[PDB]
Design a protein around this ligand. Structure first.
Ligand SMILES: CCCCCCCCNc1nc(N[C@H](CC)CO)nc2c1ncn2C(C)C
Lengths: 826, 327, 248
């Protein structure tokens, strides 16, 4: 039944991969940046990047590699989507007309296979004879790069080594060779095989296996003159080529895990390395030429250059310029200097590209009383952590508030003209027995500060041992002014106490407005936390006061204000507390039929419970009796990431598989069995990971609203920085927009020839369903961008229904008007 | 005494919530007021009275009071709604079948969340399942509805089989006419896609094999929505039914009717080459087309894969818990 | 765990029926008629012999807990057979049982079903299920007669005569309260003991222990001849009082 509409307000910003090459012309130097489902093509200049083209694809971009087959003038682009949609693409430009050619395409999914732990890997031969794909444990898939393979047909070679860490095609080999690090019970080893297109199997590889570091992570293919491979770990870097073996183990890299690599000098003399704390290193290959005229690797050296944003991908461009692709914080252009500055650094930032990073939580607040509404996000992680203030003004205006620690939850308290923000920072066990923070951050730079002195958990019979160098999270409640975003106060919670939930509200007959935090005692030994606190704070006159504390037997994953009472979820339990005249929390009633009560939302006396593995539940408070009632459950099991209530009958959910769904009350009340079934009337593959749903709109709707067909407004934040909006439609409007989608999909040419219907199909490893109850507003909003011939082709034979006129033909100009009104909801 | 079923009232249980939609009534989770034990209550509604007390429930009562095994769900008692006072006709109150409460069902564990299954976790799982099936098969009972949802798992690693609603006795001496459509299509054997109608205990073995494969991929093996499409998928893997491998296939009602696209060759070992050797041999034998050549439950327990598994070492499946809450 | 379904002959003088003023002869007659009703109805419907017996065993047990004066017997019998069909997987629609019951009962007898025969029966299912304590599984002398006969080796024709004569004795014992006094295994042996004594056969000769004169003890442990003799006496009592004679 329920009909809804989903549009993008801000496209994915997190950088998911980046390559360089000669894609647009055999002459230009290109930088291709991949954000989730989005490809950005840039041209490298002496000042920075000149953008040239951006396309969307109907799939999450998993593999992106540039290769130049023999006979081609310029590089071609290979992409594989997370649904295993593969394609080869070409850039073609005719004067002012830029388009992307689909040269070959197909889906490489296997009927049977176990998806691998280290994810899809895609590598291409140096000789461009074949494309290698590691999709499933125990299997290696080969797409031969022959001229006739326009469908990208492929075969699997049985692979004995089931648990593969990373694999790359090796340079400087007589036959196509793969070098891979694998894990078996004896540790990790490096092994090589040769790949045979004629025999369609592996043959014994060129050089000997060895046992490598236990945490060996990445494989680097070194080009001639060197040949062979370099293996990056947590503590050591090793180079293997035939019988040659080197190992450098500088103490500096042990401090932080290395995650990305990129070649600087095409000859392999220099490589870039980055680590999770954002440090950027230079890996140097010291050459020694022999009397044979041959060149051998003499030694390896590692030199620290400076600090960059935590980088998911690096790519060196030209001269001293490096592009830093960050998934957790802002991406950058940085220049590497030969001479260090006075602080010892060789790295100086050039440009900063906004990344909303992971949006852990967010709230909508009208800071200026305009009625427009502004969006305050918890964005970024670790040192890239920040708040973001977002308002419409045609682009979005975004203010950034750096925190240098991970923000977890945010909530606005108008009475105090400030925000409350939960945050965690990393300290390391130091020689004092205590801990030391790697850097100062918001919770340490607060004007005034406090620390919980709670004695509740002081009664620990069992202690917990600490080793020097281990990381710990230190959680804080931050009080932040709504005009200056100065950290006015920082409250530090107990040792090993995690802050999980935050609300601002009044309770009972108590006129004071409080900050309330739910916590969990997290010990490495415990699979599931068994201790926790609900803490009532009051922010008054620049100081946070501890008002009351209620001990609980679990983690307070979620809390919410409920008609003057406090609704909190503790592990499996959902509890309702009353606030007494003695300023203490008193339990009224409980619900125990859950696995883990991760998410809570309310409306009136109804409560929506989001569970770890049991989808969504509709609870109701029955005031006559003073307890809970089960209205209905979604017995179709799903792993929830966030939930929201749309109206008294429809409920919205987000899956850990990047899927959205809507459940409704069956409203066919004959048997209790029907009433207690929430039926999944809506299914939609979003492609993003939704952390937070939040009612509100950023548009100026205070008297400027006029009228829109869409009703309601839910914003949501995702891990890749994408912000979207969900809204409801009348049956009439859905049918019109849906019928138009089917017309647009026939007209619009997809990159990679990916069927739009396939892309939006609900998808887990176990199920694939066609989408239902959802209009892809981003497809609808593309009607305005298609050429006039295509618009009129779309409207041919299009009829309206349930209107002033029952059947009414559509013209191309009629739909341009409707779509433009739909673009005004964001 | 403990044996006087049907009299004790459901007042003795505090109802926690509804855990599932059953065949003959809703299933509830509850706590025993006196002991504190958690139980599951299958509600039996005869208020429809089209044919009175459902046979599906009658089967589960008749059989589960006979079957006692660690891997077979236990029916603890039967309790009733407050009965109408002094009237035996106006009473429309329902009966409740009291079972032990199991923490999770297998469908739930896989469909949602990444539950990790190592070789040893699968060994302990399959050994319990097949051992239970052997107990039932030695007692000459056929489950006939083996699905992932009907396999229950406590966090302790104990496995128990659950929904005996479609179970009936099997006589090898006296072949009897049976109901053709018995197992769910995803886990249905080929002979029942061709309509044997006189099925052997081997039907259950095929289902458990489909599970064995599913545990190694986390995805069901034969996902099809129509009877024919299932036979095509089964054929793409196991080979097409033909007298060469199944001499009696020609006797089945639909053999000539439901031909697959090709006469496929068996690829089971190739498309499952990533499975351990001991396991692949078990899968190959369980997923044999001819039910008279398909291994029995006893033979599976006497396999290199399960023979030496020590049941004392439960080896629970890996459950994420706190770590999974926030990625 | 499981309920005890066996009483002593002496205990039958204290059934509810007896204590409401029904005399022993009448309750025996009522049981015979109720049993023969169940037997005849299910036979007309084509029911397996186990299904008939199971209904009869429910019926005989039922009137250990209720009085014949408050529960009309032919309604009870029909209800027993209905459930017995579902238990033993030989099901019938309630409307079909009523149809057959009406064919076989006169107008007075069918009066017990009141104004709505199907209803009077379906409603009783609730009571029967609680009464039998949901012990739906029942074993019958038939299976033990065959399991034990299969282990007899000798003259094929003499053994088959023994089996058919004993089988008839089993069918006749369903009308008696023996179903309530002795486990079915004993019944199967007792009927073998009676058929042999009437056929002047010496069964031990056909056993694996031909010099073990108490041949039955290898089948049923701990059975004194007294028990077998008491059972035999009760079966032949039904034959002598009526006009019918031993099958031979
Ligand atoms: C919060 C919602 C879910 C939480 C609970 C997850 C399943 C609980 N475990 C059981 N599941 C089932 N299966 C049901 C129908 C067959 C549906 O799963 N039957 C069970 C269970 N415990 C005992 N029994 C007896 C009746 C056999």
């Amino acid at each position: 039944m329920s009909y809804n509409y989903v549009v993008t307000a801000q496209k994915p910003t997190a950088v998911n991969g980046c390559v360089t090459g000669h894609f647009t012309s055999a002459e230009d130097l290109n930088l291709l940046i991949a954000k989730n489902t989005r490809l950005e093509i840039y041209v490298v200049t002496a000042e920075g990047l000149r953008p040239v083209k951006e396309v969307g694809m109907y799939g999450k971009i998993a593999v992106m590699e540039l290769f130049r087959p023999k006979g081609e003038s310029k590089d071609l682009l290979f992409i594989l989507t997370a649904k295993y949609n593969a394609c080869i693409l070409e850039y073609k430009q005719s004067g002012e007309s830029i388009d992307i050619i689909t040269r070959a395409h197909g889906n490489v999914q296997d009927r049977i296979g176990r998806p691998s732990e280290t994810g899809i890997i895609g590598i291409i031969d140096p000789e461009c004879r074949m494309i290698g794909l590691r999709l499933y444990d125990g299997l290696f898939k080969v797409i031969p790069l022959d001229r006739d393979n326009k469908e990208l047909k492929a075969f699997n070679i049985r692979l004995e080594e089931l648990h593969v860490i990373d694999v790359k095609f090796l340079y400087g080999c007589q036959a196509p060779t793969i070098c891979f690090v694998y894990q078996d019970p004896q540790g990790r080893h490096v092994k090589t095989y040769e790949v045979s297109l004629r025999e369609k199997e592996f043959n014994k590889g060129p050089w000997k296996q060895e046992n490598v570091e236990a945490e060996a992570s990445m494989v680097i293919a070194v080009p001639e003159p060197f040949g062979g491979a370099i293996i990056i770990g947590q503590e050591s870097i090793t180079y293997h080529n035939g019988d040659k073996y080197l190992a450098i183990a500088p103490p500096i890299i042990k401090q932080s895990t290395i995650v990305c690599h990129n070649r600087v000098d095409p000859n392999g003399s220099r490589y870039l390395l980055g680590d999770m704390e954002g440090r950027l290193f230079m890996l140097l290959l010291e050459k020694e030429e022999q009397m044979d005229g041959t060149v051998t690797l003499k030694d390896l050296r590692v030199e620290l250059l400076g600090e960059t944003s935590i980088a998911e991908c690096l790519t060196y461009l030209d001269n001293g310029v490096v592009f830093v692709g960050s998934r957790l914080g802002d991406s950058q252009l940085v220049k590497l200097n030969v001479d260090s500055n006075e602080q010892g650094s060789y790295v100086v930032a050039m440009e900063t590209f906004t990344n909303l990073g992971p949006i852990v939580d967010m709230c909508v607040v009208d800071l200026e009383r305009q009625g427009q509404g502004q969006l305050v996000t918890c964005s970024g992680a670790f040192k890239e952590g920040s708040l973001r203030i977002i308002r419409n003004g045609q682009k979005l205006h975004i203010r950034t508030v750096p925190l240098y620690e991970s923000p977890r939850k945010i909530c606005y308290q108008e009475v105090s003209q400030c925000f409350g923000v939960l945050s965690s920072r990393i300290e390391v066990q130091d020689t004092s027995g205590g801990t030391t923070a790697l850097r100062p951050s918001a919770s340490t730079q607060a004007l005034s500060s406090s620390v919980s002195s709670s004695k509740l958990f002081s009664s620990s019979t069992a202690p917990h041992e600490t080793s020097f160098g281990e990381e710990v999270e230190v959680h804080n409640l931050l009080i932040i002014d709504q005009h200056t975003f100065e950290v006015l106060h920082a409250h530090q919670f107990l040792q090993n106490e995690y802050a999980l939930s935050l609300v601002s509200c009044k309770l009972g007959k108590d006129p004071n407005t409080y900050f309330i935090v739910g916590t969990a005692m997290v010990y490495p030994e415990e699979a599931e936390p068994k201790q926790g606190r609900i803490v009532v704070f009051q922010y008054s006159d620049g100081k946070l006061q501890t008002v009351a504390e209620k001990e609980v037997k679990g983690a307070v994953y979620s809390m919410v204000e409920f008609n003057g009472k406090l609704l909190a979820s503790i592990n499996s339990t959902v509890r309702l507390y009353e606030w007494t005249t003695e300023k203490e929390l008193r339990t009224e009633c409980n619900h125990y039929n859950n696995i883990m009560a991760l998410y809570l939302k309310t409306k009136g006396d109804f409560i929506l419970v989001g569970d770890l593995m049991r989808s969504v539940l509709l609870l109701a408070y029955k005031p006559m009796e003073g307890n809970f009632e089960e209205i209905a459950r979604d017995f179709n099991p799903n792993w929830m990431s966030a939930v929201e209530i749309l109206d008294d009958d429809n409920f919205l959910g987000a899956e850990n598989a990047f899927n959205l769904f809507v459940c409704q009350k069956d409203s066919a009340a004959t048997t209790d069995e029907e009433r207690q079934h929430l039926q999944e009337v809506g299914l939609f593959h979003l492609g993003e990971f939704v952390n937070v749903f939040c009612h509100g709109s950023l548009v100026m709707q205070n008297l400027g609203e006029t009228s829109t067909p869409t009703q309601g407004s839910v914003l949501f934040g995702t891990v890749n920085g994408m912000i979207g909006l969900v809204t409801s439609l009348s049956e009439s409007w859905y049918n019109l927009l849906l019928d138009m989608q089917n017309r647009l999909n026939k007209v619009i040419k997809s990159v990679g020839k990916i069927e739009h219907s396939f892309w939006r199909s609900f998808h887990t490893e176990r199920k694939t369903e066609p989408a239902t109850g959802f209009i892809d507003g981003d497809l609808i909003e593309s009607f305005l961008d298609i050429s006039r011939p295509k618009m009129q082709e779309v409207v041919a034979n299009l009829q309206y229904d349930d209107g002033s006129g029952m059947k009414r033909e559509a013209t191309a100009d009629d739909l341009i008007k409707v779509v433009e009104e739909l673009t005004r909801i964001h | 005494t403990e044996s006087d079923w049907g009299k004790r009232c459901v007042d003795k249980f505090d109802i926690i919530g509804i855990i599932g939609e059953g065949t003959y009534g809703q299933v509830y989770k509850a706590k025993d007021k006196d002991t504190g034990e958690l139980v599951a209550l299958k509600k039996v509604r005869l208020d429809n009275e089209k044919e009175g007390f459902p046979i599906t429930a009658i089967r589960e009562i008749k059989i589960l009071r006979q079957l006692i095994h660690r891997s077979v769900v236990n029916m603890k008692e039967i309790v009733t709604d407050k009965q109408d006072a002094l009237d035996f006709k106006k009473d429309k109150g329902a009966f409740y079948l009291v079972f032990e409460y199991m923490d999770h069902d297998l469908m739930g564990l896989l469909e949602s969340g990444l539950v990790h299954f190592s070789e040893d976790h699968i060994k302990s799982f399959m050994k319990q399942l097949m051992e239970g099936l052997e107990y039932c098969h030695k007692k000459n009972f056929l489950h006939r509805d083996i699905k992932c949802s009907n396999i229950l798992l406590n966090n302790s690693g104990q496995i128990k089989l659950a929904d005996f609603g479609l179970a009936r006795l099997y006589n090898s001496e006296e072949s009897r006419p049976y109901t053709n459509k018995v197992i769910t299509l995803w886990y249905r054997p080929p002979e029942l896609l061709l309509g044997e109608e006189r099925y052997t205990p081997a039907i259950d073995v095929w289902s458990c094999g489909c599970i064995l494969g599913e545990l190694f991929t986390k995805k069901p093996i034969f996902q099809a929505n129509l009877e024919l499409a299932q036979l095509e998928l089964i054929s793409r893997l196991c080979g097409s039914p033909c007298p060469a491998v199944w001499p009696d296939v020609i006797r089945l009602p639909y053999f000539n009717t439901m031909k697959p696209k090709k006469q496929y060759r068996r690829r089971l070992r190739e498309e499952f080459s990533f499975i351990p050797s001991a396991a692949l041999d078990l899968l190959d034998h369980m997923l044999t087309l001819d039910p008279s050549k398909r291994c029995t439950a006893e033979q599976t327990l006497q396999s290199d894969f399960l023979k030496d598994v020590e049941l004392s070492k439960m080896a629970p499946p890996d459950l994420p818990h706190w770590q999974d809450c926030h990625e | 765990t499981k309920p005890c379904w066996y009483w002593d002959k002496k205990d039958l003088a204290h059934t509810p029926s007896q204590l409401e003023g029904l005399d022993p002869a009448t309750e025996a007659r009522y049981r015979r008629e109720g049993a023969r009703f169940i037997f005849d109805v299910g036979t007309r419907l084509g029911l397996h012999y186990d299904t008939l017996a199971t209904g009869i065993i429910y019926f005989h047990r039922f009137y250990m807990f209720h009085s014949f004066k408050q529960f009309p017997r032919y309604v009870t019998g029909a209800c027993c057979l209905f459930l017995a069909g579902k238990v033993e997987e030989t099901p019938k629609k309630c409307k079909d049982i009523i149809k057959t019951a009406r064919s076989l009962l006169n107008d007075v007898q069918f009066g017990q079903f009141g104004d709505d025969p199907k209803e009077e029966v379906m409603v009783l299912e609730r009571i029967l299920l609680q009464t039998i304590k949901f012990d739906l599984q029942v074993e019958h002398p038939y299976q033990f007669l065959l399991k034990y006969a299969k282990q007899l080796k000798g003259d094929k024709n003499k053994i088959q005569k023994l089996v058919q004569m004993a089988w008839t004795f089993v069918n006749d014992s369903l009308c008696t309260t023996l179903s309530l006094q002795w486990e079915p295994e004993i019944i199967a042996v007792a009927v073998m003991y009676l058929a042999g004594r009437l056929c002047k056969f010496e069964i031990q000769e056909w056993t694996s222990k031909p010099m073990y004169r108490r041949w039955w003890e290898q089948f049923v442990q701990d059975v004194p001849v007294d028990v077998l003799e008491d059972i035999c006496h009760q079966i032949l009592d039904l034959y002598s009082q009526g006009k019918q004679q031993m099958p031979h």
